[PDB]
Short mmCIF file of C-alpha atoms in Angstrom, two decimals:
data_model
loop_
_atom_site.label_atom_id
_atom_site.label_comp_id
_atom_site.label_asym_id
_atom_site.label_seq_id
_atom_site.Cartn_x
_atom_site.Cartn_y
_atom_site.Cartn_z
CA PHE A 1 -16.40 -9.81 22.91
CA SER A 2 -16.16 -7.03 20.23
CA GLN A 3 -19.56 -5.62 19.20
CA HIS A 4 -20.75 -4.61 15.68
CA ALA A 5 -24.16 -3.17 14.94
CA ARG A 6 -26.28 -1.88 12.01
CA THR A 7 -29.70 -0.16 12.25
CA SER A 8 -31.58 0.71 9.05
CA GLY A 9 -34.80 1.93 10.76
CA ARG A 10 -36.47 2.73 14.09
CA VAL A 11 -35.57 -0.56 15.88
CA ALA A 12 -32.03 -1.51 16.91
CA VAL A 13 -30.71 -4.78 18.37
CA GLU A 14 -29.50 -2.96 21.50
CA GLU A 15 -28.21 -5.79 23.69
CA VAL A 16 -27.22 -9.46 23.19
CA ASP A 17 -26.57 -11.68 26.22
CA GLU A 18 -23.25 -13.55 25.67
CA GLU A 19 -24.71 -16.27 28.04
CA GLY A 20 -27.75 -16.58 25.65
CA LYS A 21 -30.59 -15.74 28.06
CA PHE A 22 -32.04 -12.82 26.08
CA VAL A 23 -31.96 -10.43 23.09
CA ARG A 24 -33.11 -6.80 23.64
CA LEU A 25 -34.47 -4.63 20.85
CA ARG A 26 -34.79 -0.86 21.29
CA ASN A 27 -36.96 1.62 19.44
CA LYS A 28 -34.32 4.46 19.31
CA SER A 29 -36.83 6.77 17.55
CA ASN A 30 -39.65 9.15 18.70
CA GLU A 31 -42.20 7.09 16.64
CA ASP A 32 -44.08 3.79 17.29
CA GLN A 33 -42.94 0.83 15.12
CA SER A 34 -45.23 -1.97 13.91
CA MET A 35 -43.32 -5.26 14.32
CA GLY A 36 -46.12 -7.75 13.49
CA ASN A 37 -44.74 -10.89 11.70
CA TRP A 38 -41.10 -9.68 12.14
CA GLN A 39 -38.38 -12.23 12.91
CA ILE A 40 -35.12 -12.52 14.87
CA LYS A 41 -32.49 -14.60 13.03
CA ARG A 42 -29.74 -15.88 15.31
CA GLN A 43 -26.57 -17.40 13.83
CA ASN A 44 -24.01 -18.84 16.30
CA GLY A 45 -20.86 -19.80 14.38
CA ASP A 46 -21.69 -22.87 12.27
CA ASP A 47 -24.66 -23.99 14.42
CA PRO A 48 -28.16 -24.37 12.78
CA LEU A 49 -29.98 -21.02 12.30
CA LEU A 50 -32.38 -19.98 15.09
CA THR A 51 -35.55 -18.15 13.97
CA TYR A 52 -37.89 -16.37 16.41
CA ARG A 53 -41.11 -14.94 14.95
CA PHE A 54 -42.99 -12.01 16.52
CA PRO A 55 -46.84 -12.21 16.91
CA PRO A 56 -48.93 -11.25 13.74
CA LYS A 57 -49.74 -7.91 15.44
CA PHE A 58 -47.15 -6.19 17.74
CA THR A 59 -46.08 -2.57 18.35
CA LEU A 60 -42.74 -1.40 19.81
CA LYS A 61 -43.45 2.09 21.18
CA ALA A 62 -41.20 5.19 20.83
CA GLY A 63 -38.04 4.76 22.94
CA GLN A 64 -39.24 1.43 24.46
CA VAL A 65 -37.30 -1.83 24.94
CA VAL A 66 -38.60 -5.39 24.32
CA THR A 67 -36.62 -8.35 25.70
CA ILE A 68 -36.96 -11.78 24.11
CA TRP A 69 -36.06 -14.39 26.67
CA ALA A 70 -34.91 -17.94 26.01
CA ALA A 71 -36.98 -20.55 28.12
CA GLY A 72 -33.88 -21.25 30.29
CA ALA A 73 -33.80 -17.74 31.85
CA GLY A 74 -36.99 -18.46 33.90
CA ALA A 75 -38.56 -15.16 32.75
CA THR A 76 -42.30 -14.36 32.94
CA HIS A 77 -43.99 -13.52 29.66
CA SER A 78 -45.46 -10.06 29.97
CA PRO A 79 -46.06 -9.26 26.35
CA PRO A 80 -45.27 -5.60 25.85
CA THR A 81 -41.96 -5.50 27.73
CA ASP A 82 -40.96 -9.19 27.93
CA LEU A 83 -41.46 -12.06 25.47
CA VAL A 84 -40.66 -15.68 26.43
CA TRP A 85 -39.45 -18.13 23.71
CA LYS A 86 -41.02 -21.21 25.46
CA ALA A 87 -39.84 -23.89 22.95
CA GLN A 88 -36.15 -22.73 22.95
CA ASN A 89 -33.89 -22.97 26.08
CA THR A 90 -31.02 -20.73 24.81
CA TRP A 91 -30.23 -17.94 22.29
CA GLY A 92 -26.93 -19.84 22.06
CA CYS A 93 -23.30 -19.30 23.04
CA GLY A 94 -19.97 -19.46 21.18
CA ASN A 95 -17.27 -17.15 19.81
CA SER A 96 -19.40 -15.55 17.03
CA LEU A 97 -23.07 -14.65 17.66
CA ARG A 98 -25.08 -12.83 14.95
CA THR A 99 -28.56 -11.51 15.79
CA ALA A 100 -30.55 -10.01 12.91
CA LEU A 101 -33.94 -8.26 12.94
CA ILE A 102 -36.02 -9.02 9.86
CA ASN A 103 -39.15 -7.02 8.83
CA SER A 104 -42.55 -8.57 7.69
CA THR A 105 -41.46 -8.57 3.97
CA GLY A 106 -38.13 -10.48 4.67
CA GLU A 107 -35.58 -7.60 4.78
CA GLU A 108 -32.75 -7.35 7.30
CA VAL A 109 -33.41 -4.00 9.02
CA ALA A 110 -31.06 -4.43 12.05
CA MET A 111 -28.22 -6.58 13.46
CA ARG A 112 -25.73 -6.95 16.36
CA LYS A 113 -22.75 -9.32 16.15
CA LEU A 114 -20.58 -10.35 19.15
CA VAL A 115 -17.08 -11.64 18.20
CA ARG A 116 -14.49 -13.52 20.45
CA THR B 1 -38.66 -5.29 -9.64
CA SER B 2 -37.74 -9.03 -9.91
CA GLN B 3 -37.44 -12.00 -7.43
CA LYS B 4 -33.60 -12.12 -7.87
CA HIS B 5 -33.44 -8.30 -7.31
CA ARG B 6 -35.67 -8.55 -4.18
CA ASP B 7 -33.65 -11.46 -2.67
CA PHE B 8 -30.34 -9.73 -3.36
CA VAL B 9 -31.16 -6.33 -1.79
CA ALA B 10 -33.08 -7.90 1.26
CA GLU B 11 -29.97 -9.03 3.09
CA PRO B 12 -26.13 -8.80 3.36
CA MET B 13 -24.56 -10.66 0.47
CA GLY B 14 -21.85 -12.49 2.36
CA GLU B 15 -20.48 -15.43 0.32
CA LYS B 16 -23.22 -15.42 -2.43
CA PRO B 17 -22.07 -16.25 -6.04
CA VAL B 18 -22.10 -13.69 -8.94
CA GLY B 19 -25.35 -15.26 -10.25
CA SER B 20 -27.28 -14.11 -7.14
CA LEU B 21 -26.91 -10.49 -8.38
CA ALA B 22 -29.82 -9.14 -10.56
CA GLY B 23 -29.02 -9.01 -14.33
CA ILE B 24 -26.30 -11.68 -13.92
CA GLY B 25 -27.68 -14.54 -16.02
CA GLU B 26 -26.03 -17.90 -16.83
CA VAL B 27 -23.86 -16.50 -19.71
CA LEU B 28 -22.92 -13.21 -17.97
CA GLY B 29 -22.13 -15.16 -14.77
CA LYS B 30 -19.93 -17.75 -16.56
CA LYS B 31 -17.91 -14.89 -18.18
CA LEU B 32 -17.51 -12.93 -14.86
CA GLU B 33 -16.29 -16.16 -13.19
CA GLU B 34 -13.87 -16.55 -16.14
CA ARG B 35 -12.59 -13.00 -15.36
CA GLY B 36 -12.21 -14.01 -11.65
CA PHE B 37 -15.50 -12.76 -10.19
CA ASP B 38 -16.59 -16.00 -8.45
CA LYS B 39 -18.52 -14.11 -5.71
CA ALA B 40 -20.93 -11.16 -5.82
CA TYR B 41 -18.73 -9.15 -3.28
CA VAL B 42 -15.94 -9.06 -5.98
CA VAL B 43 -18.46 -7.28 -8.29
CA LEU B 44 -19.44 -4.95 -5.36
CA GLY B 45 -15.67 -4.22 -5.01
CA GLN B 46 -15.49 -3.04 -8.67
CA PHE B 47 -18.65 -0.95 -8.16
CA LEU B 48 -17.07 0.64 -4.99
CA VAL B 49 -13.68 1.52 -6.65
CA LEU B 50 -15.74 2.98 -9.59
CA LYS B 51 -17.25 5.19 -6.79
CA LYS B 52 -20.84 3.88 -7.36
CA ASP B 53 -20.80 5.59 -10.83
CA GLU B 54 -23.53 4.23 -13.13
CA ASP B 55 -21.92 5.13 -16.49
CA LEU B 56 -18.47 3.78 -15.47
CA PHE B 57 -19.92 0.54 -13.95
CA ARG B 58 -22.40 -0.29 -16.76
CA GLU B 59 -19.78 0.44 -19.48
CA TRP B 60 -17.33 -1.73 -17.48
CA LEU B 61 -19.83 -4.72 -17.28
CA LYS B 62 -20.43 -4.33 -21.07
CA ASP B 63 -16.70 -4.05 -22.03
CA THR B 64 -15.41 -6.92 -19.89
CA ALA B 65 -18.38 -9.34 -19.61
CA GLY B 66 -20.56 -8.56 -22.65
CA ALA B 67 -23.56 -7.38 -20.59
CA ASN B 68 -26.46 -5.89 -22.57
CA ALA B 69 -28.27 -2.66 -21.44
CA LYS B 70 -31.02 -4.52 -19.45
CA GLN B 71 -28.36 -6.65 -17.66
CA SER B 72 -26.04 -3.71 -16.75
CA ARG B 73 -29.09 -1.67 -15.65
CA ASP B 74 -30.34 -4.50 -13.36
CA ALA B 75 -26.88 -5.31 -11.87
CA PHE B 76 -26.13 -1.62 -11.08
CA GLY B 77 -29.62 -1.05 -9.58
CA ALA B 78 -29.26 -4.08 -7.25
CA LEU B 79 -25.74 -3.00 -6.07
CA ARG B 80 -26.76 0.67 -5.56
CA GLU B 81 -29.88 -0.39 -3.53
CA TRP B 82 -27.76 -2.92 -1.54
CA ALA B 83 -24.95 -0.39 -0.78
CA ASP B 84 -27.56 2.16 0.44
CA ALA B 85 -29.06 -0.43 2.83
CA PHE B 86 -25.91 -2.24 4.07
CA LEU B 87 -22.80 -0.10 3.55
CA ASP C 1 3.77 0.05 -18.44
CA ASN C 2 6.12 -2.95 -19.17
CA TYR C 3 3.31 -5.44 -20.18
CA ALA C 4 1.30 -2.92 -22.27
CA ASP C 5 -0.39 -4.11 -25.58
CA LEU C 6 -1.54 -7.17 -23.51
CA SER C 7 -5.33 -7.29 -22.91
CA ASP C 8 -6.69 -7.82 -19.34
CA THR C 9 -7.79 -11.34 -20.51
CA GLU C 10 -4.23 -12.24 -21.71
CA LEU C 11 -2.70 -10.84 -18.46
CA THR C 12 -5.07 -13.20 -16.52
CA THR C 13 -4.05 -16.32 -18.57
CA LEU C 14 -0.40 -15.32 -17.86
CA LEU C 15 -1.20 -14.99 -14.05
CA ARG C 16 -2.79 -18.49 -14.22
CA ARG C 17 0.14 -19.96 -16.28
CA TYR C 18 2.74 -18.71 -13.74
CA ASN C 19 0.56 -19.77 -10.73
CA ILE C 20 0.50 -16.15 -9.48
CA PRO C 21 -2.15 -15.70 -6.71
CA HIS C 22 -4.67 -13.22 -8.08
CA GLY C 23 -8.15 -11.77 -8.24
CA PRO C 24 -9.67 -10.13 -11.34
CA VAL C 25 -7.70 -7.72 -13.56
CA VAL C 26 -9.41 -4.29 -13.41
CA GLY C 27 -8.14 -0.65 -13.72
CA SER C 28 -7.14 -0.43 -9.99
CA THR C 29 -5.34 -3.88 -10.03
CA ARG C 30 -3.64 -3.85 -13.52
CA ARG C 31 -0.31 -2.21 -12.39
CA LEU C 32 0.00 -4.54 -9.37
CA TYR C 33 -0.40 -7.73 -11.51
CA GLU C 34 1.99 -6.39 -14.20
CA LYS C 35 4.57 -5.93 -11.31
CA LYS C 36 3.89 -9.53 -10.09
CA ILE C 37 4.31 -10.87 -13.72
CA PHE C 38 7.60 -8.85 -13.97
CA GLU C 39 8.89 -10.11 -10.55
CA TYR C 40 8.05 -13.72 -11.64
CA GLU C 41 9.63 -13.63 -15.19
CA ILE C 42 12.78 -11.81 -13.84
CA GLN C 43 13.58 -14.76 -11.44
CA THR D 1 -6.72 -1.68 19.55
CA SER D 2 -6.90 2.10 18.87
CA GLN D 3 -10.01 4.35 19.10
CA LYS D 4 -9.92 4.80 15.24
CA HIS D 5 -10.06 0.96 14.78
CA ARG D 6 -12.91 0.56 17.34
CA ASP D 7 -15.07 3.31 15.83
CA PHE D 8 -14.53 1.95 12.30
CA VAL D 9 -15.40 -1.75 12.97
CA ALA D 10 -18.42 -1.03 15.29
CA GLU D 11 -20.75 0.35 12.57
CA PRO D 12 -21.38 0.64 8.79
CA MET D 13 -18.91 3.05 7.14
CA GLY D 14 -21.19 4.71 4.57
CA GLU D 15 -19.35 7.66 2.99
CA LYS D 16 -16.84 8.21 5.88
CA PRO D 17 -13.50 9.75 4.71
CA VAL D 18 -10.43 7.44 4.15
CA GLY D 19 -8.79 8.84 7.30
CA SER D 20 -11.50 7.07 9.37
CA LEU D 21 -9.87 3.79 8.35
CA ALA D 22 -7.39 2.56 11.01
CA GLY D 23 -3.74 2.92 9.96
CA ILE D 24 -4.63 5.85 7.61
CA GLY D 25 -2.77 8.89 9.01
CA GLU D 26 -2.55 12.45 7.54
CA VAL D 27 0.13 11.71 4.86
CA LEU D 28 -1.35 8.25 3.88
CA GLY D 29 -4.89 9.70 3.65
CA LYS D 30 -3.65 12.65 1.57
CA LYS D 31 -1.78 10.27 -0.83
CA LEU D 32 -4.95 8.04 -1.18
CA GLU D 33 -7.32 10.99 -1.84
CA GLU D 34 -5.05 12.25 -4.67
CA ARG D 35 -5.22 8.67 -6.16
CA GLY D 36 -9.06 8.76 -6.00
CA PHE D 37 -9.42 6.80 -2.72
CA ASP D 38 -11.09 9.68 -0.79
CA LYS D 39 -13.72 7.58 1.06
CA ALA D 40 -13.12 4.44 3.17
CA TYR D 41 -15.68 2.53 0.91
CA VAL D 42 -13.30 3.03 -2.15
CA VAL D 43 -10.51 1.31 -0.16
CA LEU D 44 -12.97 -1.42 1.00
CA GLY D 45 -13.75 -1.86 -2.76
CA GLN D 46 -10.02 -2.41 -3.46
CA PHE D 47 -9.82 -4.97 -0.61
CA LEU D 48 -12.82 -6.81 -2.25
CA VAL D 49 -11.49 -6.86 -5.89
CA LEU D 50 -8.25 -8.28 -4.32
CA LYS D 51 -10.48 -11.08 -2.83
CA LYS D 52 -9.76 -9.86 0.78
CA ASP D 53 -6.11 -11.05 0.28
CA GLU D 54 -3.61 -9.79 2.94
CA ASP D 55 -0.45 -9.91 0.80
CA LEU D 56 -2.09 -8.27 -2.24
CA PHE D 57 -3.83 -5.48 -0.28
CA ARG D 58 -0.83 -4.57 1.93
CA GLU D 59 1.46 -4.53 -1.15
CA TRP D 60 -1.01 -2.31 -3.14
CA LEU D 61 -1.27 0.10 -0.12
CA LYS D 62 2.55 0.34 0.20
CA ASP D 63 2.93 0.90 -3.61
CA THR D 64 0.02 3.39 -3.99
CA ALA D 65 0.31 5.61 -0.89
CA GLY D 66 3.60 4.67 0.86
CA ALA D 67 1.96 2.84 3.80
CA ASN D 68 4.40 1.22 6.29
CA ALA D 69 4.14 -2.32 7.77
CA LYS D 70 2.11 -1.11 10.84
CA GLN D 71 -0.26 1.08 8.75
CA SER D 72 -1.08 -1.63 6.12
CA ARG D 73 -1.46 -4.24 8.95
CA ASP D 74 -4.00 -1.96 10.71
CA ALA D 75 -5.87 -0.94 7.49
CA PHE D 76 -6.18 -4.64 6.43
CA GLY D 77 -7.24 -5.87 9.89
CA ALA D 78 -9.89 -3.09 10.15
CA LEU D 79 -11.35 -3.88 6.66
CA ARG D 80 -11.28 -7.68 7.31
CA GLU D 81 -13.07 -7.27 10.72
CA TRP D 82 -15.55 -4.82 9.10
CA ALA D 83 -16.29 -7.14 6.07
CA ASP D 84 -16.71 -10.19 8.38
CA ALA D 85 -19.42 -8.23 10.28
CA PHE D 86 -21.34 -6.09 7.71
CA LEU D 87 -20.84 -7.67 4.24
#
């Protein structure tokens, strides 16, 4: 897998599990980022789009990492550091995986794409 | 700022048609497609070879596709805003 | 500078007529399509 | 894959110089800059107005700046991989 990434603001899509168990977002800045009502848009090849929505109030602190686990991973939901996507078993697998971070007003602010 | 402008600059353009770009109405879109600009990325291409220059791009849209001042202004603004966010 | 006096719009209809694979005719593509029209006509 | 290729396709290009584009050596880069293609985005723009076409882009690159088969192959492949990810 070849990796491609774009970060417009404070939060980057740092790591994408090729086995689909998680997505990790990192606040690469020295400031706290409000991420309330933000969304993760996951596009695996030609599969239907996967949308994960963040709670209506959520803060990713300066330099911190938040992992969003798919239900299949058997992770424990511990809100600040770890979020469990209960209704979805996988982030998805395939040869092309595109994970985008969308802000509260519908703008793509970050992305990581895994190819081959 | 318009709905078409907001929706265009919010995300990567990918495979979007010329009409998705702000200022590109039905007439202006039909003429750009007639010139071979089926997709909005083909218009971005012209904007990029014209080195993001406003005067050169708006005079180009006017000369080749009959764009009025409001149309050329809106198309350039959307592409400039998009290139700053995604390029 | 072999197909001069021909507008970009007439060069396009000529690319279409000769089934020459092409994109739009703009300042940075003009010379290349004129060369393709020349290569076509001269065969 | 070279280091130049890997660095180019991993992130947005912005206003990076032409030489950052894989396949673009000293001579090639110099020849492009004198033709107005001083930034990699101007060359991406050319690739887009040519509808991302391999034959058309490689032929333009050979005719404009004297690029060889390996150079045009690498410049095309880098722009194609980049546009598939970020456009």
